[PDB]
Design a protein around this ligand. Structure first.
Ligand SMILES: *[C@H](O)[C@H](CC(C)C)NC(=O)[C@H](CC(C)C)NC(=O)[C@H](CC(C)C)NC(=O)OCc1ccccc1
Ligand SMILES: *[C@H](O)[C@H](CC(C)C)NC(=O)[C@H](CC(C)C)NC(=O)[C@H](CC(C)C)NC(=O)OCc1ccccc1
Ligand SMILES: [Mg+2]
Ligand SMILES: [Mg+2]
Lengths: 300, 300
């Protein structure tokens, strides 16, 4: 059981480079539109307190330099949608996959194609934290890298990288420019607030462990939804609902282990620790696998 | 700091499906040759004790069905090289990237494009263990999935998946068909032997932690190569050499922390445990990042 990203080839064909002034970052080229973070128009001084409407008014189509590999795209229109800039270009991307723009929920996962200067660097699998941050690896110039899921042949774009809030914690928007969480694209200190552990993901991962022969943690107890959620609150785990029980149905039926039974095992993991032992090669409870991720990786 | 795979698009364009009899698996289509595990010619009974030379003699070009998406490739020659079958087809793959075949060393890393029926499923980053196994996620029909590294525009293929030795541990060949380790492509029980922790990778990861602000583990001590390797042997860590010290040079110079100083810190991590604390969000020492992987992810 590995943390698996989606194959990134369909997204690789959409990455371009966007330059305005001296600032360069990544753009997503779909049909005849290039999407990128609006702060590409900012100077370093601008970023401390930008008036984006005023700043964009001083830019014309020809101040936006868009480069797809080594061919240069002619910008014929520009528009601000929330925190994203949409650059109308004169050429439809011939590599445009079937795609949708989706806004994901906290606790769902996606792949990130980290890019620099319009060039792919690596791919990794992320979860949208309950506090709407992402724990990623993003260096300067990675802005505009996108997060996505693939359903057969259709790419569902769900995230675009905008900013680093603190060491190792990042924030961004959907592809309509709306930030996930309360963040703004301004270089002023911003609080993310208390995060929580994604309970249903932890349970899915425990099922993954059972499916892969790892079962030391299974205990003699059961529990109730309410009894468990009292334990969940003390450990800053999200409350478990019947919706979550339902989504775990494939895993509970595959293993013959009732969800409430697994909750009892999790509760004892929480109150007693792991005692130097290991689950699926990890010494902490992993919460960045959704139930679908587990079924997917166990279905091929 | 995330475990990052290479962008998989260049490899996606080379995956095909290979069927012989009822057995189907993945093939790698490069130029006018398709590479795949030779056990595609085996029945379930054959796999218990195959005579591959005898079994292949009963197959002609037309018993090999090769499918690239929905177009079918005409097989005009077949050849066994070690444990790999090479199927000469009548069409060069128009998506063939610049590529090399390389045989990696234990402790080096690579990306795996897990595939089923010739179709990409996911990508993840792996290390070749010191005992020449890989800890991956491979279901039935994943054989022929390949491991690779990318240097700018050139794909270095280094691994092809052949078999599961035990729950969660896998074995395979280079692209010349030579198994990594002592394994054979036969369904008989096979020992992998004692694994060891990749010391130089652990040290690189500790540097990654310092680069990312995580430094609680840094201590007041230093040590010597010989003193440290006495501690390494007791904990089944590979001995550290001056070659390894040299490769850590970029990280030691970036952080201002001497390698032997970090070894002292690692030694105390080893003898005292982690005391419920965390390094880069992990509760165990991670050894599947090479020094180059760390420089790469810290260089963009
Ligand atoms: C885009 O490529 C780049 C990637 C970063 C990893 C550098 N992002 C930005 O340039 C972005 C532009 C502003 C207008 C949103 N700024 C940041 O991401 C910035 C980087 C940190 C290291 C300063 N983060 C930020 O401003 O968060 C708010 C903040 C302010 C002051 C102190 C801490 C946090
Ligand atoms: C290819 O797609 C497939 C992927 C496996 C994950 C199923 N591999 C094989 O079909 C391969 C063919 C043989 C001739 C190498 N067999 C295995 O991989 C087999 C699977 C296990 C679950 C039986 N592993 C194996 O034979 O290892 C040796 C062995 C034998 C007996 C008991 C334990 C281990
Ligand atoms: Mg912005
Ligand atoms: Mg074989």
């Amino acid at each position: 059981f590995r943390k698996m990203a989606f194959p990134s080839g369909k997204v690789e064909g959409c990455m371009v480079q966007v330059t305005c002034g001296t600032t360069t970052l990544n753009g997503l080229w779909l049909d005849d539109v290039v999407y990128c973070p609006r702060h590409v128009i900012c100077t370093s001084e601008d970023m401390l307190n930008p008036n984006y409407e005023d700043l964009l008014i001083r830019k014309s189509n020809h101040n936006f330099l868009v480069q797809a590999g080594n061919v240069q795209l002619r910008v014929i229109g520009h528009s601000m949608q929330n925190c994203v800039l949409k650059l109308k270009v004169d050429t439809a991307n011939p590599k445009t996959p079937k795609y949708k723009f989706v806004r994901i929920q906290p606790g769902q996962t996606f792949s990130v194609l980290a890019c620099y200067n319009g060039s792919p660097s690596g791919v990794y699998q992320c979860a949208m934290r309950p506090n709407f941050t992402i724990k990623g690896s993003f260096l300067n110039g990675s802005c505009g890298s996108v997060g996505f899921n693939i359903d057969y042949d259709c790419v569902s774009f769900c995230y675009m990288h905008h900013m680093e809030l603190a060491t190792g914690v990042h924030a961004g928007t959907d592809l309509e420019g709306n930030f996930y969480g309360p963040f703004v694209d301004r270089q002023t200190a911003q609080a993310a607030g208390t995060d929580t552990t994604i309970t249903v993901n932890v349970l899915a991962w425990l099922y993954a462990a059972v499916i892969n022969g790892d079962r030391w943690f299974l205990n003699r107890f059961t529990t109730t939804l309410n009894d468990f959620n009292l334990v969940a609150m003390k450990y800053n785990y999200e409350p478990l609902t019947q919706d979550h029980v339902d989504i775990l149905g494939p895993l509970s039926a595959q293993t013959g282990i009732a969800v409430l039974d697994m909750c009892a095992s999790l509760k004892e993991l929480l109150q007693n620790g792991m005692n130097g032992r290991t689950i699926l090669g990890s010494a902490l409870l992993e919460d960045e696998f959704t139930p679908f991720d587990v079924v997917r990786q166990c279905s091929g």
